[PDB]
Scaffold this active site. Structure first.
Site, short mmCIF file in Angstrom:
data_model
loop_
_atom_site.label_atom_id
_atom_site.label_comp_id
_atom_site.label_asym_id
_atom_site.label_seq_id
_atom_site.Cartn_x
_atom_site.Cartn_y
_atom_site.Cartn_z
N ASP B 162 1.38 -1.37 -0.02
CA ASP B 162 -0.24 -0.11 0.10
C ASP B 162 0.82 1.01 -0.32
O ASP B 162 0.39 1.76 0.88
CB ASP B 162 -0.66 0.07 1.14
CG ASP B 162 -1.96 1.55 1.36
OD1 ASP B 162 -2.49 1.90 0.23
OD2 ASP B 162 -1.83 2.11 2.31
N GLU B 400 3.20 -7.91 7.23
CA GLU B 400 1.96 -8.78 7.11
C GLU B 400 1.89 -9.58 5.46
O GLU B 400 1.25 -9.77 5.10
CB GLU B 400 0.76 -7.26 6.74
CG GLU B 400 0.16 -6.07 7.60
CD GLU B 400 -0.73 -5.63 7.20
OE1 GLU B 400 -1.17 -5.56 5.87
OE2 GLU B 400 -0.94 -4.68 7.82
N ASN B 454 -1.22 -5.23 13.52
CA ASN B 454 -1.71 -3.99 12.87
C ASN B 454 -3.61 -4.76 12.93
O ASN B 454 -3.98 -5.31 12.19
CB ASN B 454 -1.87 -3.85 10.91
CG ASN B 454 -0.14 -3.68 11.23
OD1 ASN B 454 1.12 -3.75 10.14
ND2 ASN B 454 1.42 -3.18 11.45
N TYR B 456 -7.08 -3.03 12.81
CA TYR B 456 -8.37 -1.49 12.50
C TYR B 456 -10.10 -2.17 12.73
O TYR B 456 -10.29 -1.68 12.13
CB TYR B 456 -8.56 -0.93 10.66
CG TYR B 456 -6.42 -1.03 10.54
CD1 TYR B 456 -6.28 0.14 10.27
CD2 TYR B 456 -6.19 -1.83 10.02
CE1 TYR B 456 -5.46 0.69 10.00
CE2 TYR B 456 -4.82 -1.29 9.94
CZ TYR B 456 -4.51 -0.05 9.50
OH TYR B 456 -3.42 0.12 9.04
N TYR B 460 -11.54 -1.27 9.58
CA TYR B 460 -12.00 -1.93 8.60
C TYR B 460 -13.08 -2.93 8.47
O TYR B 460 -13.81 -3.73 7.61
CB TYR B 460 -10.87 -2.56 7.86
CG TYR B 460 -9.30 -1.77 7.14
CD1 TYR B 460 -10.25 -1.19 6.19
CD2 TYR B 460 -8.55 -1.74 6.99
CE1 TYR B 460 -8.96 0.08 5.27
CE2 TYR B 460 -7.18 -1.30 6.46
CZ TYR B 460 -7.48 -0.02 5.98
OH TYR B 460 -7.00 0.58 4.38
N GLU B 493 0.06 -0.36 13.98
CA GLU B 493 -0.77 0.15 13.18
C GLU B 493 -2.24 0.55 13.40
O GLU B 493 -2.55 -0.93 14.11
CB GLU B 493 -0.79 -0.14 12.03
CG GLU B 493 0.13 0.02 10.96
CD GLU B 493 0.08 -0.57 9.89
OE1 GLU B 493 -1.18 -1.22 8.85
OE2 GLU B 493 1.61 -0.80 8.80
N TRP B 538 -0.98 4.80 12.45
CA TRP B 538 -0.25 4.89 11.01
C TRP B 538 -1.46 5.41 10.74
O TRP B 538 -3.14 5.38 10.66
CB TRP B 538 -0.96 3.27 10.73
CG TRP B 538 -0.37 3.20 9.39
CD1 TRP B 538 -1.70 3.03 8.00
CD2 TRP B 538 0.67 3.25 8.23
NE1 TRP B 538 -1.28 3.36 7.39
CE2 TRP B 538 0.71 3.03 7.65
CE3 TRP B 538 1.93 2.86 9.28
CZ2 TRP B 538 1.86 2.41 6.20
CZ3 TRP B 538 2.83 2.29 8.61
CH2 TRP B 538 2.94 2.46 6.99
N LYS B 557 -4.70 9.05 6.93
CA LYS B 557 -4.58 7.54 7.98
C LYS B 557 -2.93 9.01 8.56
O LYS B 557 -3.54 8.29 9.63
CB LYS B 557 -4.01 6.51 8.28
CG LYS B 557 -5.63 5.58 7.66
CD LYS B 557 -5.25 4.10 8.02
CE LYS B 557 -6.45 3.00 7.22
NZ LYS B 557 -6.12 3.19 6.22
#
Ligand SMILES: [Mg+2]
Ligand SMILES: [Mg+2]
Lengths: 588, 588
Positions: B162, B400, B454, B456, B460, B493, B538, B557
């Site tokens: 990304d 990741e 990480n 979210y 997400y 993150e 992040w 972000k």
């Protein structure tokens, strides 16, 4: 029963009930008196007026209440409450007594006030609105209940559509005093002559009771009398046609008589024009049209989905200044006010019922899509409300249903028939098609008159990659053209999310420049598809949605911002649409 | 072979070769002379300096070329070109002759200039850079070739990560004249005393040739001599420790001697501090640390991934003003300059190799992930370059990767060993884990010292729904804590895309207010997880990415904008991180 726009006439007293109402989210005993702790305005969506999220996201019953003075009602009259609409469901109370009910958030209905209350000084009107969407409602919602350990139950609706579920009394509410024996409905029909210069008119007037005489007086735009009949038939010589962006409206004054005296008088406008579909063309007044315009929303800051007649006019002024000529009422019937305005301005309108969300999300064995009843009702109400509008040139049965799945054909077959059976003018009906339902897969499009497609090559497919998007869009339009050599094609949605202020040299999606590039590529393809007769951008203006990762504080595919300020791409459309004539025959 | 920062010393002449170079995208015969039609700057990413998309998206060979004057080189000296890095692959030419080569876009290498050319006036240096990413490179790219019908071939890389694939000569290039017999490497090792007040130092000096004497003179921050040795061993009484946000650096002047005379002199800094991991804690100098800081990127307007020492300092000043104390070099080694700065400022650094993209996208039967060689090389180069930095407290093996799929363990087992085998300090190694690889599924985390996640929830998963995000984040951290009661956990993150200017009353994702709400919810959970010893947002700042629908002109972000201007949420972090001490033992 509420198919006629509420007018003031010498026989019909129409009072606006709008303004401040006592208001409450949640439960309420209509026999008791709502406090003035909370108030709400009519008309408006309630959501944006809430300062907290929990209140703005409320789902269930909420109430409006006001004590209203009773006007003089004579022995031969009756008193009704007439709602432009309540979103989504409504129960209406007079003095704590249930007195009427409605389902469907975008069509009008009336509710009779009990005669026994006419000699009272005051009546308390209570409106219990409800904003739950279901598998039985239109639009389709994903309904669920979670217990809070409070343990109250939190209701929530996961919309099966891409627009925020604004609710409330969005449209004017009227207190209406009218004759017991009144004109219930007027249907206007015309057969234009061979050369389009004359019109044989048929005025079909519905009554509830016997009438001795039905006089119809027609006036032209100068209010001069040009015809009169007592038999429902009128021949008009040398008429002025309703032409695109050049409207001409007659008005039909309908008077009924019993025993030598006026019982009721109503004035209904109509326009004269002919619609036909053949050879991959959309004919208006026997000339081939090219649609240019917008998918729209009834959406605005503060008011949400509430009626703002000034936004209707500002949009329409912009539309016509751009060289555009049409728009679709996505994804639900607009207000009567907007329809009457489109008529007055000569704008073409694709009129749709709220059939959005007809798409599941293993599996599905059980009958979860119970939408048929609501669908049939929506269709009846829209046609009954809107059939006389010269601006309405086509009906939509659904937006982006799952038309590629087994059972789709059989669901839509009777609904398409319904439009035909109900529309005196037998206008074209269409179905708006999602990308999943490709020419091979789709199984519904044989039923319809015009092919409408929402396509986003370069945005959802081939994101930001124009070179390949072009090959894809072209490929598919050629397959459609081939599968249905007969039917016209209209792009009902295409666009690209664009945030004002975002800029780049490198054709970057979300920038203003990319929006321009996206449309250039799209038009380069369209111009080479002979059967593509119209293009309607998504969207006119940015608009509010629910929380979903690909929505950056709403939808931003608008050529204008939500505040109606132009984005870079507006200059471009103005150059293109002022160069393409309304009556444009490609083919050639 | 390029493990030492290029310094000017009385035995080492170091010349900066940066500035304007002839430049060309595409093919070039290095025996011929590149025109000055195109030029490019060193150091900088080339991409943003291109005015057209086609040029900015170019993939393949591109060349830098300059004629360079040859300085005086004595008989006992040699001349090398030293690159901070070339992204991603590089072939180096002198006078049209291939003279060296490198793979890996984020680590330094040197290239010997042929001795036979030292008596020449001028040499032409040609750099053939290449920016293709593969299944054999790090980072991992999805490589493909499409023939144009031109019919040239268009190369493209669909990044498996990304961040925008910035390429070019991002870091200073030096012409380096040094002794034939020189100090090749210096490794600094220390054993601190029981009470942390003294240090037994071991300076391990590598040479290529015989040396008569190796004198090491250590100086403190006041440049005062505090120790000297001729045997590689030094005992320092009453040292000043390198403490978080309060750095203390010694410098080790290393001089080598042959036959009673100076052959070479180099000055290497070191800092004294101890790292340990036990009982779900990260100990620094035997006290429990709480990480607060940022995942970062080497990213900036104009320069892309090119080195900007002023951005390093502005970021670091902001970091420390906020009360933060660390950052991760996501997702590739940063420049030496940044490392030396972190040392000077006392900032903790999690140092990572470019192992991002190790994740496929049926199926996969054939061996497509050929990344092992590049991975082993990346690890060797980073450890050899960075091992002496007191600021480097932990290594990352991958970001990741697909650590939940069969074969993951066996890929990482030897790579984790490699860090251990190479690091004189045997610092902790970690693996940064994706949401898919949940406690049950994951099969790699037993191999590592510290759990990095990480996560979210609220972005997400459960997008914009904090109530449920909270239950999810808490649930999972409790499972991790339970599965590994021993290991510390660090959130590497967490954040939420936020566009400056977007505002709402209703906690709407993408607005500045939601960013604040998201972090409040996250910290409320973290504060109740005993084994969670650190939090790194992040991202520090917004940064450039490729075209993908969930990227609104890059990643947003960041707590700061790309231009380093604060978003609303910065005030909040400053209140929180100034309240939490660096040496913070939770547990308690
Ligand atoms: Mg089913
Ligand atoms: Mg495989």
């Amino acid at each position: 029963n509420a198919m006629l726009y509420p007018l003031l006439t010498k026989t019909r007293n129409t009072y606006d009930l709008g303004g401040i109402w006592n208001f409450k989210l949640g439960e309420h005993n209509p026999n008791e008196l709502l406090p003035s702790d909370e108030v709400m305005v009519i008309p408006t969506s309630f959501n944006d007026l809430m300062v907290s999220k929990e209140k703005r996201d409320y789902i269930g019953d909420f109430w409006y209440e006001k004590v209203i003075e009773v006007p003089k009602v004579s022995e031969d009259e009756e008193m009704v409450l007439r709602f432009g609409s309540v979103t989504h469901q409504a129960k209406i109370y007079v003095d704590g007594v249930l007195v009427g009910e409605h389902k469907g958030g975008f069509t009008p209905f009336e509710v009779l006030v009990p005669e026994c209350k006419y000699n009272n000084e005051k009546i308390k009107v209570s409106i219990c609105a409800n904003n739950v969407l279901d598998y039985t409602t239109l639009p389709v919602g994903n309904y669920s209940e979670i217990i809070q350990e409070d343990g109250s139950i939190k209701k929530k609706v996961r919309e099966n559509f891409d627009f925020f579920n604004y609710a409330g009394v969005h449209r004017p509410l009227k207190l209406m005093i009218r004759p017991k024996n009144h004109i219930f409905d007027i249907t206007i029909t015309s057969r234009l002559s061979d050369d389009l210069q004359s019109a044989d008119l048929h005025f079909l007037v519905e009554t509830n009771q016997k009438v001795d005489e039905v006089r119809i007086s027609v006036f032209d735009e100068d209010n001069k009398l040009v015809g009169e009949t007592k038999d429902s038939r009128l021949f008009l010589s040398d008429v002025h046609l309703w032409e695109v962006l050049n409207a001409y409206l007659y008005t039909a004054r309908v008077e009924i008589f019993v025993d030598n005296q006026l019982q009721d008088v109503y004035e209904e406008n109509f326009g004269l024009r002919e619609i036909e579909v053949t050879n991959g063309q959309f004919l208006l007044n026997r000339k081939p049209i090219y649609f240019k315009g917008f998918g729209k929303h009834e959406d605005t800051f503060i008011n949400g989905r509430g009626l703002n007649e000034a936004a209707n006019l500002m949009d329409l002024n912009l539309l016509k200044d751009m060289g555009a000529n049409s728009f679709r009422t996505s994804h639900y019937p607009y207000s009567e006010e907007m329809m009457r305005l489109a008529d007055r301005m000569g704008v073409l309108v694709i009129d749709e019922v709220p059939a959005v969300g007809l798409f599941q999300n293993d599996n599905g064995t059980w009958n979860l899509m119970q939408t048929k009843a609501a669908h049939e009702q929506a269709i009846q109400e829209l046609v009954k409300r809107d059939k006389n509008h010269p601006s309405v040139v086509m009906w939509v049965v659904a937006n982006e249903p799952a038309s590629h799945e087994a059972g789709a054909h059989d669901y839509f077959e009777p609904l398409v028939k319904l439009y035909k059976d109900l529309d005196p003018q037998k206008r074209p009906v269409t179905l708006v098609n999602i990308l999943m339902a490709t020419p091979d897969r789709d199984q519904v499009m044989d039923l319809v008159d015009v092919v409408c497609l929402n396509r986003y090559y370069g945005w959802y497919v081939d994101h930001g990659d124009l070179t390949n998007a072009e090959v894809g869009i072209r490929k598919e339009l050629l397959e459609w053209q081939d599968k249905f050599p007969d039917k016209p094609i209209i792009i009902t949605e295409y666009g690209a999310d664009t945030l004002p202020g975002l800029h780049s040299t490198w054709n970057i999606p979300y920038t203003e420049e990319f929006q321009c590039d996206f449309y250039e590529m799209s038009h380069r393809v369209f111009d080479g598809i002979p059967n593509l007769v119209g293009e309607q951008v998504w969207n006119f203006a940015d608009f509010e949605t629910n929380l979903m990762i690909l929505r950056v504080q709403g939808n931003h595919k608008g050529l204008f911002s939500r505040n109606r300020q132009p984005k870079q791409v507006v200059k471009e459309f103005k150059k293109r649409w002022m160069t393409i004539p309304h009556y444009h025959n490609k083919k050639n």
